[PDB]
């Protein structure tokens, strides 16, 4: 026969699967705090706000309040709010987390929020099952979902192409501020320095002003220089990877190697190493170590992030290993990682 | 000025965050290993299987077996599956919260998973934000979604009715041993019960067969008794419960009220009420009691599922002070809760 229960059926445990089933009403009720701005409305405000009190306060009118508690009730479970009896009023508050959706401040995750929970950036995701039995289509779920690949996609929707930049261009504020000042050394002696697929220039903007005497360097397709605001002191160039580097004492790629599988990363690499000095020349690569031997707070977010580029680059994130693999590979002398309590690590790749 | 951060950046908060973010990933890819059947290939193995093992038994061929790697690290990581070294190679086993994934009994979360997952049936909670600044318009998110209201939508698209017909069957499924187990005593001195609203009949078949000497009903609208299997003993009616409740000595309502909002459930209550005998009547809410004071192991699903009702039926999960208004408010004499280690709990309501 099979299994059969003859006492005390877990509840702990299916309600874990239920959890694990219900994990996208956290990312869209999140959504929806973000675009209610409820955090800046209390935030700003100095002190916690009854239901009335913020809804007046809202982005539009009119407001059901109703559908504002039960949310609120979701949020207050959730630890980002707080809600306590105070004066005889009820009122709503921030809890610590909840710092990371106030406006104004470096760690504030706003941006990225709106593009990761956008509908049709969340579409790819439903095509899972698909990116393993592939039924001989070699296409990304992006594709699958949205038409064509990620990269022509955002040359043919402005409207997401910005999304997308500025959910990066978030991504990068979150690290500017480590990097420049725990990583002041690797920009010693640099003269210039090109950010390959550097976005909408959020990493030479920050670079240029830390470092006034490096000429910086924003490389990118013209889809994404075209998003970018205009540029004095710092290079704009548009143009393709695979086909041009721009030479530099420097060369930087943030969240670039993990869009591309192995044999295009080495191509890439190749590519900067000939790009930089003999003498003191060095490739800043940023991008998650994966370790799979021990557990880590940011851990769970980048073996989602290994998936995501599955789905929507055919990239991959890489564990050291496979990391000291592929700048073998490319040719390179050594490597030297330095750890900045982020998402992403720096990894600097010798040339000579 | 504002606060300035000078120390001391906290991960742990931040990756709250992200996983918040990412809650989308837990449901998607818990989907794809469902579809992917992984859990049941693994369980009918009877012992831990190699990546090459599994693949070969994959629902179709060819297989991306590094796509597969990929999905089972994630699957790993959440403590669904386990991942380990036996006599010299890598074999993928069950976790224990994966027996609620293995199909041959009534706690298999399947057909559930399926239905929660889907990507039409996901598309309502991109409206949340709607649902609090409604700018005038009184529809469901649902229909904000996918055109009409969840009844008439079910009406009109045949493979969704059934989609989601199963999947409240097995909800039903998983609360059904305790039912007549627990609560056998509640079908004392009952010759007949009418299930409305009662789907597909897993509620009434699975009575009939504990009790039988009650004569059971299932009654529903018309598209649901369309897509529910032919009957021999139990009564299979259709029609509109808010126009007629097919009279019996007691009435049953699993996942009703919640669908609905106050002035609606009193007008069913009445109805239901007015159903039954003034000797010994009864009429049996199966719904969540939600605890506003204290957390319990299905709280943050329950509060989940209040939000689920605010989107796709416009109705709400109720406290118990809610719920005794609103027996009260039908003109009931008592109530009598009886908990049973589901989601939802017994309510008997009794109209004298
Ligand atoms: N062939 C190519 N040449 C130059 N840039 C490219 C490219 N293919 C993709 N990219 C760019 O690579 C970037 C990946 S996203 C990373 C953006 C930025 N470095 C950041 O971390 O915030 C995108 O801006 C994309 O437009
Ligand atoms: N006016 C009406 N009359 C009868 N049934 C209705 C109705 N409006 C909605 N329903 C039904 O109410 C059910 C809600 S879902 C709950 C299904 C079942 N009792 C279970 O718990 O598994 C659906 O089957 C839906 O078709
Ligand atoms: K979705
Ligand atoms: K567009
Ligand atoms: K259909
Ligand atoms: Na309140
Ligand atoms: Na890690
Ligand atoms: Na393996
Ligand atoms: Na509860």
Redesign the interface.
């Known amino acids: 026969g ?2 059969v ?1 003859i006492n005390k ?24 705090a973000v ?2 701005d409820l955090a800046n409305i209390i935030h700003n405000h100095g002190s916690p706000m009854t239901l009335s009190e913020l809804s007046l306060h ?7 309040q109703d ?2 508690y ?2 609120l ?2 949020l207050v ?2 630890k ?1 709010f707080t809600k306590s009896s105070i004066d005889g009023e009820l009122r709503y508050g921030l809890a ?2 909840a ?3 106030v406006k ?2 470096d ?1 504030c ?1 706003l941006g ?2 709106l593009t ?2 956008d ?1 049709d950036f ?2 790819p ?2 095509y ?2 698909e ?6 289509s070699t296409s990304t779920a992006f594709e699958k979902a949205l038409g064509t690949n990620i990269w022509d996609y955002m040359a043919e929707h402005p409207e997401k192409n910005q999304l997308f930049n500025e959910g990066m261009a978030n991504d990068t504020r ?1 690290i500017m501020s ?1 990097l420049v000042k725990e990583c002041s050394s690797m920009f010693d002696g640099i003269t210039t320095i090109v950010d390959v697929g550097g976005g909408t220039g959020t990493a030479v903007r920050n670079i240029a002003k830390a470092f006034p005497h490096i000429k910086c360097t924003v490389y990118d397709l013209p889809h994404v220089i075209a998003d970018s605001p205009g540029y004095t002191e710092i290079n704009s160039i548009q143009g393709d990877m695979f086909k041009y580097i721009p030479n530099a004492d420097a060369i930087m790629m943030k969240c670039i190697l993990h869009d591309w599988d192995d044999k295009e990363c080495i191509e890439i690499l190749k590519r900067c190493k000939d790009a930089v000095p003999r003498d003191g020349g060095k490739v800043i690569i940023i991008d998650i170590i994966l370790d ?1 031997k021990s557990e880590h ?5 980048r ?2 992030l ?3 580029m ?1 789905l929507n680059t055919g990239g ?1 994130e890489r564990t050291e290993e496979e990391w000291k693999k592929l700048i073998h590979d490319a040719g390179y002398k050594g490597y030297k990682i330095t750890h900045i ?1 982020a ?1 992403q690590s720096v990894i600097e790749a010798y040339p000579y």
Chains 1, 2 share one sequence.
């Open positions: 099979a299994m229960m059926e877990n509840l702990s445990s299916q309600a874990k699967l239920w959890n694990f089933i219900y994990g996208f009403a956290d990312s869209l009720v999140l959504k929806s675009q209610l809202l982005p539009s009118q009119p407001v059901n559908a504002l039960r949310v009730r979701y479970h959730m980002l610590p987390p710092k990371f959706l104004g401040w760690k995750m990225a929020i990761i929970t509908k969340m579409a995701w439903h899972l099952k990116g393993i039995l592939n039924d001989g979150l480590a799979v707070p940011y851990t769970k977010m073996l989602t290994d998936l995501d599955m991959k309590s998402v």
